């Protein structure tokens, strides 16, 4: 577990060096993907249906 | 030099990424066992 503390001792550093994905972007990544599939398949489902 | 350090540092990443490549393979080396 001290290695786990070391993992957290360094995972936190990467957390500060690289801030975690904020929940706002999670909505985008989970919502912006909806058009990325819906809009992309919106043409596919109508182009050559 | 910053470039040589950039090559060496990215090389150190290459030295470590292969170590990660070896280390990650070691993780895969046990799951099937």
């Amino acid at each position: 577990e001290r290695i786990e503390t070391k993992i957290l001792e360094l995972e936190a550093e990467r957390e500060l060096l690289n801030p975690p994905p904020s929940p706002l972007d999670k909505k985008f990544e989970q919502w912006e993907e909806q058009q990325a599939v819906e809009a992309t398949l919106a043409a596919m489902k109508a182009r050559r249906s | 030099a910053p470039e040589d350090l950039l090559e060496r540092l990215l090389g150190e990443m290459e030295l470590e990424l292969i170590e990660l490549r070896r280390a990650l393979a070691q993780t895969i080396a046990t799951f099937k066992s």
Partner: protein, 56 residues
């Protein structure tokens, strides 16, 4: 960098070609996933594409 864009764009076309073949007769589930695969390359196409213009 431009050669990479063409290769990535060709890969996107290759994925689009697979998407073009993964779409027929109601196989939208595979297309649903397959189309998402290209958008990952499109990000590169847009990301590298915009960078190429700036470098000019």
């Amino acid at each position: 960098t431009e050669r990479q864009r063409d290769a990535q764009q060709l890969i996107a076309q290759r994925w689009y070609e697979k998407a073009q073949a993964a779409l027929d007769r109601g196989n939208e589930q595979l297309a649903r996933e397959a189309l998402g695969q290209r958008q990952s390359y499109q990000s590169h196409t847009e990301a590298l594409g915009k960078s190429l213009g700036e470098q000019r």
